[PDB]
Write a protein that holds these residues in place. Structure first.
Motif, PDB file in Angstrom:
ATOM      1  N   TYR A  62     -10.498   5.119  -4.429  1.00 13.20           N
ATOM      2  CA  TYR A  62     -10.027   5.277  -5.965  1.00 13.20           C
ATOM      3  C   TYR A  62     -10.934   4.184  -7.097  1.00 13.20           C
ATOM      4  O   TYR A  62     -10.338   4.769  -8.308  1.00 13.20           O
ATOM      5  N   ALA A  63     -11.613   3.408  -6.398  1.00 13.20           N
ATOM      6  CA  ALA A  63     -12.126   2.471  -7.185  1.00 13.20           C
ATOM      7  C   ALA A  63     -13.699   2.054  -6.815  1.00 13.20           C
ATOM      8  O   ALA A  63     -13.839   2.735  -5.798  1.00 13.20           O
ATOM      9  N   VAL A  98      -3.844  -4.131  -9.643  1.00 13.35           N
ATOM     10  CA  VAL A  98      -4.700  -4.601  -8.545  1.00 13.35           C
ATOM     11  C   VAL A  98      -6.179  -4.315  -8.707  1.00 13.35           C
ATOM     12  O   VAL A  98      -6.301  -3.095  -9.313  1.00 13.35           O
ATOM     13  N   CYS A  99      -6.914  -5.489  -8.805  1.00 14.92           N
ATOM     14  CA  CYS A  99      -8.425  -5.039  -9.037  1.00 14.92           C
ATOM     15  C   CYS A  99      -9.194  -5.896  -7.854  1.00 14.92           C
ATOM     16  O   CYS A  99      -8.589  -6.278  -7.031  1.00 14.92           O
ATOM     17  N   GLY A 120       0.423  -2.044  14.422  1.00 12.32           N
ATOM     18  CA  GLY A 120      -0.254  -1.669  15.612  1.00 12.32           C
ATOM     19  C   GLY A 120      -0.856   0.007  15.204  1.00 12.32           C
ATOM     20  O   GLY A 120      -0.907   1.041  16.120  1.00 12.32           O
ATOM     21  N   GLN A 124       5.367   1.947   9.770  1.00 12.55           N
ATOM     22  CA  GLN A 124       6.396   1.070  10.080  1.00 12.55           C
ATOM     23  C   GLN A 124       7.647   1.106   8.945  1.00 12.55           C
ATOM     24  O   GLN A 124       8.738   0.909   9.141  1.00 12.55           O
ATOM     25  N   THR A 126       8.500   3.809   5.985  1.00 13.85           N
ATOM     26  CA  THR A 126       8.500   5.203   5.300  1.00 13.85           C
ATOM     27  C   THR A 126       8.903   4.963   3.743  1.00 13.85           C
ATOM     28  O   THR A 126       8.022   5.531   2.925  1.00 13.85           O
TER      29      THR A 126
END
Ligand SMILES: Nc1nc2c(ncn2[C@@H]2O[C@H](COP(=O)(O)OP(=O)(O)OP(=O)(O)O)[C@@H](O)[C@H]2O)c(=O)[nH]1
Ligand SMILES: [Mg+2]
Lengths: 142, 10, 198, 180, 18, 570, 415
Positions: A62-63, A98-99, A120, A124, A126
């Protein structure tokens, strides 16, 4: 399950790496280089799905930094994309805007979040709030 | 640059 | 004690491949010199630098005993660093995880949930044929627990053990019995995944 | 340069020392380490990996690194030999068949150039039954008197009773620490 | 002075060769 | 941006026009399509400033093919600039006229080219010659119609020795693309005139002067001797290209030289110091020097007979340089330096380059095969490499041993026992097939040949076609030699390769072997286990016709590629 | 015969390009980077690339690859010489060879590239001549290029006529691991920085073995260079005729002659290395350096580089003379000595630990190389006889020359 999930930038630099299959270091490096070349040598109208080495090599970034997944041919293709989107949303919520720069500085935090989310190669957590709360509680421990 | 931009822009 | 952020900034400041390789070699030499003295105060920074160098494509063979030593430590940050090192640079073919079995067994009964959960996640990610043989009983013990946050981890560990050791699935038949009424979504998903794997 | 801070630290105790925990499996090495650290005989699971602990006695923190006697853990004792100053070997006087194996393991450990500055620390484990040997028969069988350039001391310690652990610790401190 | 050998004066030709 | 630049260029301010030109040049260099502003800059082209004129000319040259229609508004400017009193302006105009790839632009530039052909300035003459050569390359018919061949030919016998060299190079380039009809070859007076001006030519003109002599074929010993004497001083030139051209010219002249005369010996003696000097050139030219030496090695191998120490690959030498050095040592290998070659191969075998190690092993094997005096030394080196505990090294040693057994197996029975237990678990087809062939052919010094072949028979039906054929041949040879311990093994091999083998060639070979076994087992020894003749090794020397052609083409791209000049161009 | 010579960048971006013939499309430069990347990853990378029917020869520069694409079978040696001349011209004009000066002097760089070569044939190659007609801060072309003397500009006037020579000696020794020297060649270097008035014609004269034999004085110490290369201004005709080194000295520092011959004498510095490396326990560096040179000569800035282990850490140095510093970037320990007098014996005892985990792959055994440099020493023994400085006007010159002895390819093979 997801055989390996690695976050690679557009220029080819890898910002994340998490392989659930034990492979040799040279073999793992060669596989990562091949995956980067395939993603770097693929267009935007390729469906974000590649059948490389009999693995659902799903690339969806997406970036500028892209993400790649490798799952067996036993589940739906949209499930991997949904899991990737959920993980990206959880990471953005945990960090905040977040960049690419924040990912490199928060490599340990990103690895811890990935471990607490998927272990794994299987899902884990949901829910999206329970995992975030658990990560925050673990971080607050010290 | 292109790195400081948000991954999802949310 | 070089911080991980400082090492990342130094790596980013290098443009030529040779200069970046030289900086990585210098950082690895400094980390090895610090580890050779048995340093335990700035061990987290050294572990982070070693992990960053390994992710960038640098050798980390010498940074194996330090991770094992930090795994059996008591600090939460040191334990997390050791678990991350075992997950990333530790594998079945590495052969350095044999000594990690005792540490995993000791941390399997730890009262702290983060330590036990981190150990379970590391065992699931780095499941071995021999580690699962000596850890199959511990995984089955936690499968019957009522901890929602630990039920998913126990189910994942059982699934990993079954995948690595198909002959060990016979011991998980009664552990998952009467587990379809879990209110938590994660516990129900883990139970469904374990049933499908079986 | 000035060493006033070092002298001040050493006036009230600065030396720590080191120690190692090696020997055959079921030889009381883990029990000996627990007695040295805690002081009770607690049953523990087999040492698949290693045990890390520290014991402070006489103002010296002699850390002990437990090493299992398993076949998969016997060759791993070289990993713990790095950054180690002492080594304590627990013999199994009640295991005649395993006595030869313990002696061979001790000889292999002492036959390494890296492990040369560490003095021999032979502990007569299982010294609670009549079948256990004395402090000289076990050393003679293990050939501790032929370990040239090595300070080996044979001491009999019972895991259940705990007697002789203080004497062994004092002997190790005297061998390592040469101060007043 | 200068590192690598001090500079020395040079002649014009071999005076002994005529 | 674009509008502002156009407005600035359409103004009467010199500073603004200069700033606009600089911005356009920076954008063009940075990767900006500034061809759309070419018509705007056409009006702002006739400027007194020389800096702006150069930028305008560069933009027109780079924007001529993109906008050929818009280039029609510069013919008048080019004509006006062709008569500029400043020699630099005239040279720039001449260069721009020939640099414009316009079909209708060069037609109107024929008059300026003719006017500048007789330019008195040596720089002007060189520019005119370059423009004429460019026009001939773009349009040979136009150049022929303009009659520039006569002007180019007469430029060689004029002053301006750099201009003469430029004209000679232009004439050679025109003839190079010409079909050879009406060549510009000159008589010995022309060669003497070029040689006289060779000492006054510059570094660039020396190559052009020496290129003309490369096409000339000497016909007399006196002329050849004079040419060799003149080219001898060129060997003491700091220019690597000039030295290479002189060496190529000397090699070409040596084709008609007489070995009885002392001129050939003097040329050979003076060529070795030149080769030694060239071997210590820069890494970029090191490959070219190595290729030139290899090309001339097949012609006069005695020139570099004593050049062996310099052939060693340095620690800091590149991979290509190391490969060229190894190839030179292999081609220059001799019994005099056999020990040095073996030491270099042993030292070269300890490197961390897998390709380098393989090349060193191949060179050692080739040296052992070519020279039988070092067969024992080669066998010892191969045994040491095998014992070195290297997978690639072990495979190379096994391949070398197999090759030596097929070439010199008379005294190869002392290595069967050593090679019998030599980490035979390697699955490399080249090493496995070589070991199987060695065991089958040398199944006399090993008492466990059947036992060794038993392990390789587990996957004979699925190992490989060549591997399966080699295993079947080894089994047949063992049965013919010792059928008491291989009677069941031969039957099992025939059954596996006859019923479970679907390969056509392999199936046919198995059927033939079974028929031979069932027809006459005694005759199988004389038919299958027959004494093969001497193996004809492939000669690495190039054909004499190609060697003679490659001698003339010295320093070109074909010499580096080791291919004919017509087999590499497009 | 390159179609177009262009300057690339470390990221594949072309800093500057200039087509000369137009027979090769400018878009072929983009494919050069992928070809180089593929060659590097497979070991087939070479300076002369090949993109189909067009060859893109490239030279590894300080910061950019000087890719000179060619289409036909042009002179590879000529292309390399042109690239070297262009690099030298850029270094003379710009003190820095990187992207900073590539995009900073584009206005003058384009003019210099256009004037240097036309239609693939270089025309101007003199740095002084190029600077006298093209400057970054234009008149007619100088007559020096048109005239025969293109290496000595006329009309130069100086207050004093002083020429500084440099007798540079490179001692290269190729000592194998067995202790024997394989490649022992010494290459001379006669470089003079002539700074006088006018265009004097230097008359080089030295104690050459060939000249001494020709003159009948072949009884003293004479230098017999196996390969002798004259400068551009040096007339090859005089040298071939009677070894007369007569040429016009250049304006500035230039290389007149460069001797090159094998050396049959003992090495200047004798270095013996001992590797007491334990099996993953410790490492021993028994490095002993013996000065084989004359005691009257001191090797200034002697640095004997001893390659230490790649994974070695916590090293201890026990030497006698010279500081020992371990550089993690170089992965070796260099026995640096400020002053190394001849006959000195320096003994060192290295001791460092090794990691418990063994290395996954081998690292090789790079040769040990020393950086000894003893000035005012003439190992070859060649002494300059005279320098015939003659000027039409007539002046008294005061030439100077210094003999410098250093270590070149003095690498000793590791055990
Ligand atoms: N009950 C008892 N056990 C003793 C005595 N002396 C030695 N032991 C041994 O000490 C062992 C204690 O087990 P651990 O705590 O694991 O220590 P260890 O002997 O080193 O065994 P490992 O850790 O597996 O190598 C028992 O198995 C006994 O065999 C004693 O006097 N009484
Ligand atoms: Mg124990």
């Amino acid at each position: 399950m997801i055989h390996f999930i690695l976050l690679f930038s557009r220029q080819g630099k890898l910002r994340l790496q998490k392989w659930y299959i034990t492979l040799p270091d040279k073999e793992r490096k060669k596989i990562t280089r091949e995956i980067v070349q395939i993603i770097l040598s693929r267009g935007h109208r390729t469906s974000s799905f590649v059948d490389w080495k009999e693995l659902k090599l799903v690339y969806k970034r997406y970036a500028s930094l892209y993400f790649c997944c490798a799952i067996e041919n036993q589940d739906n293709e949209l499930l991997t994309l949904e899991i990737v989107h959920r993980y990206v949303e959880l990471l953005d919520k945990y960090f905040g805007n977040v960049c690419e720069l924040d990912i490199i500085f928060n490599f340990e935090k990103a690895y811890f979040i990935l471990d607490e989310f998927i272990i794994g190669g299987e899902i884990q957590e949901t829910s999206k709030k329970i995992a975030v709360k658990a990560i925050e509680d673990s971080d607050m421990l010290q | 640059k292109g790195e400081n931009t948000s991954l999802l822009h949310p | 004690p070089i911080r991980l952020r400082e090492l990342i900034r130094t790596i980013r400041t290098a443009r030529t491949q040779a200069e970046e390789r030289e900086m990585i070699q210098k950082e690895c030499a400094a980390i090895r010199s610090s580890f050779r003295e048995e340093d335990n105060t700035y061990r987290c920074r050294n572990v982070a630098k070693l992990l960053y160098m390994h992710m960038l494509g640098y050798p980390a063979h010498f940074g194996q005993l330090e991770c094992l030593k930090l795994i059996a430590s008591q600090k939460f940050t040191d334990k997390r660093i050791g678990y991350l090192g075992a997950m990333l640079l530790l594998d079945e073919r590495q052969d350095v995880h044999l000594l990690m079995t005792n540490c995993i067994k000791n941390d399997l009964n730890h009262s702290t949930q983060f330590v036990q959960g981190l150990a379970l996640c590391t065992l699931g990610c780095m499941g071995s044929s021999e580690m699962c043989r000596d850890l199959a009983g511990e995984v089955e013990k936690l499968l019957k627990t009522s901890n929602s946050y630990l039920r998913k981890k126990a189910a994942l560990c059982a699934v990993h053990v079954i995948r690595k050791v198909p002959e060990l699935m016979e011991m998980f038949l009664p552990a998952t019995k009467n587990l379809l009424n879990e209110k938590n979504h994660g516990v129900l998903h883990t139970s469904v995944v374990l049933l499908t794997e079986m | 340069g000035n060493i006033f801070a070092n002298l001040f630290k050493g006036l009230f105790g600065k030396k720590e020392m080191r120690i190692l925990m090696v020997g055959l499996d079921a030889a009381g090495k883990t029990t000996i380490l627990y007695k040295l650290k805690l002081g009770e005989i607690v049953t523990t699971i087999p040492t698949i990996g290693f045990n890390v602990e520290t014991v402070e006695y006489k103002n010296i923190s002699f850390t002990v690194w437990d090493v299992g006697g398993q076949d998969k853990i016997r060759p791993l004792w070289r990993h713990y030999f790095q950054n180690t100053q002492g080594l304590i070997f627990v013999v199994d006087s009640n295991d005649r068949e395993r006595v030869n194996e313990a002696r061979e393991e001790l000889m292999r450990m002492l036959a390494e150039d890296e492990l040369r500055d560490a003095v021999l620390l032979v502990f007569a484990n299982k010294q609670d039954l009549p079948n256990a040997m004395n402090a000289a028969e076990i050393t003679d069988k293990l050939g501790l008197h032929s370990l040239r350039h090595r300070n080996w001391y044979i001491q009999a310690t019972c895991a259940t009773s705990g007697d002789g652990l203080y004497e062994g610790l004092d002997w190790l401190s005297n061998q390592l620490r040469n101060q007043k | 002075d200068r590192k690598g050998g001090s500079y020395s004066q040079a002649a014009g030709s071999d005076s002994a060769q005529s | 941006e674009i509008f502002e630049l156009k407005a600035e260029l359409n103004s009467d301010k010199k500073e603004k026009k200069k700033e606009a030109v600089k911005k356009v040049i920076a954008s063009m260099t940075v990767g900006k399509d500034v061809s759309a502003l070419f018509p705007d800059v056409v009006n702002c082209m006739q400027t007194d400033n020389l800096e702006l004129k150069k930028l305008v000319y560069l933009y027109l040259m780079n924007y001529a093919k993109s906008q050929p229609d818009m280039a029609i508004m510069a013919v008048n400017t080019f004509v006006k600039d062709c008569e500029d009193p400043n020699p630099l302006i005239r040279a720039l105009a001449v260069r721009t006229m020939g640099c414009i790839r316009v079909d209708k632009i060069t037609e109107y530039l024929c008059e300026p080219l003719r006017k500048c052909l007789k330019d008195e300035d040596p720089y002007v003459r060189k520019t005119a010659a370059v423009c004429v050569a460019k026009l001939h390359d773009i349009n040979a018919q136009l150049v022929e119609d303009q009659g520039f061949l006569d002007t180019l030919k007469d430029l060689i016998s004029d002053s301006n020795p750099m201009v003469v060299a430029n004209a000679v190079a232009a004439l050679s380039e025109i003839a190079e693309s010409h079909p050879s009809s009406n060549l510009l070859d000159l008589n010995p007076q022309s060669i003497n005139k070029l040689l006289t001006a060779l000492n006054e030519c510059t570094e660039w003109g020396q190559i052009f002067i020496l290129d003309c002599l490369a096409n000339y074929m000497p016909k007399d010993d006196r002329e050849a001797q004079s040419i060799c004497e003149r080219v001898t001083p060129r060997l003491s030139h700091a220019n690597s290209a000039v030295v290479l051209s002189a060496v190529k010219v000397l090699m070409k002249f040596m084709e008609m030289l007489s070995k009885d005369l002392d001129y050939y010996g003097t040329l050979l003696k003076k060529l070795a110091p030149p080769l030694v000097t060239l071997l210590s050139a820069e890494p970029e030219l090191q490959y070219v020097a190595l290729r030139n030496i290899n090309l001339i090695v097949q012609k006069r191998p005695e020139i570099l007979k004593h050049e062996m120490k310099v052939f060693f690959v340095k620690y800091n030498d590149p991979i290509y340089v190391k490969l060229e050095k190894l190839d030179i040592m292999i081609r220059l290998a001799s019994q005099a330096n056999i020990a040095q070659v073996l030491a270099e191969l042993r030292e070269y075998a300890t490197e961390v380059d897998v390709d380098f190690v393989r090349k060193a092993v191949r060179a050692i094997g080739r040296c052992a095969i070519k020279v039988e005096q070092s067969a024992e030394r080669c066998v010892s080196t191969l045994l040491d490499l095998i014992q070195t505990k290297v997978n690639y090294v072990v495979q190379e040693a096994i391949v070398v041993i197999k090759d030596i057994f097929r070439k010199y197996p008379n005294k190869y029975e002392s290595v069967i026992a050593t090679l019998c237990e030599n980490l035979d678990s390697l699955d490399e087809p080249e090493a496995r097939a070589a070991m199987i062939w060695i065991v089958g052919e040398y199944a006399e010094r090993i008492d466990n040949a059947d036992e060794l072949l038993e392990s390789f028979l587990e996957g004979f039906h699925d190992k490989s076609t060549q591997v399966q054929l080699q295993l079947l041949t080894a089994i047949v040879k063992l049965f013919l030699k010792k059928p008491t311990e291989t009677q069941e093994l031969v039957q099992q091999v025939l059954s596996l390769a006859t019923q479970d083998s679907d390969n056509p060639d392999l199936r046919d070979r198995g059927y033939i072997y079974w028929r031979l076994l069932s027809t006459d087992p005694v005759a199988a020894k004389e038919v299958v286990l027959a004494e093969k003749p001497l193996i004809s090794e492939e000669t690495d020397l190039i054909e004499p016709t190609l060697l003679d052609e490659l001698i003339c083409y010295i320093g070109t791209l074909a010499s580096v590629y080791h291919k004919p000049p017509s087999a590499f161009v497009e | 015969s390159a179609s177009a010579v262009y300057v690339l960048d470390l990221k594949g971006k072309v800093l500057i390009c200039r087509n000369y013939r137009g027979d090769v499309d400018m878009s072929e430069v983009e494919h050069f980077m992928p070809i180089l990347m593929e060659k590097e990853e497979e070991g087939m990378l070479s300076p002369i690339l090949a993109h189909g029917g067009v060859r893109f020869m490239w030279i590894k520069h300080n910061n950019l690859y000087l890719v000179a694409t060619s289409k036909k079978n042009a002179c590879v040696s000529l292309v390399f010489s042109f690239l070297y001349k262009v690099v030298q011209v850029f270094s003379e004009y710009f003190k820095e060879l990187e992207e900073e000066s590539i995009r900073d002097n584009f206005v003058i760089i384009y003019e210099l590239l256009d004037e240097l070569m036309d239609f693939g044939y270089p025309q101007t190659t003199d740095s002084k001549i190029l600077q006298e007609y093209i400057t970054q801060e234009a008149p007619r072309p100088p007559a020096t290029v048109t005239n025969a003397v293109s290496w000595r500009s006329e009309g130069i006037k100086y207050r004093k006529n002083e020429v500084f020579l440099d007798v540079i000696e490179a001692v290269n020794l190729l000592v194998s691991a067995n202790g024997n020297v394989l490649r022992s060649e010494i290459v001379g270097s006669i470089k003079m920085r002539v700074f006088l008035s006018g265009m004097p014609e230097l008359r080089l004269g030295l104690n050459d073995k060939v000249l001494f034999d020709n003159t009948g004085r072949g009884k003293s110490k004479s230098v017999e260079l196996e390969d002798v290369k004259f400068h551009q201004c040096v007339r090859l005709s005089r040298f071939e005729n009677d070894r007369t080194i007569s040429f016009i000295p250049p304006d500035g520092e230039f290389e007149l002659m460069s001797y090159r011959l094998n050396t049959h004498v003992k090495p200047l510095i004798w270095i013996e290395s001992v590797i007491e490396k334990h099996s993953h326990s410790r490492i021993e560096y028994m490095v002993k350096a013996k000065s084989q040179f004359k005691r009257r000569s001191t090797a200034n800035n002697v640095e004997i580089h001893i390659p230490v282990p790649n994974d070695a850490d916590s090293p201890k140095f026990k030497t006698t003379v010279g500081s020992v510093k371990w550089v993690p970037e170089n992965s070796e320990i260099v026995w640096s000595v400020k002053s190394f007098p001849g006959g000195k014996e320096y003994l060192m005892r290295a001791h460092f630990g090794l990691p418990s985990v063994e290395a996954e792959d081998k690292e090789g055994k790079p040769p040990i190389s020393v950086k000894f440099e003893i000035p005012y020493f003439t190992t070859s023994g060649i002494q300059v006889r005279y320098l015939k400085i003659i000027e039409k006007s007539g002046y008294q010159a005061l030439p100077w020359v210094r003999y410098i002895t250093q270590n070149g390819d003095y690498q000793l093979r590791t055990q």
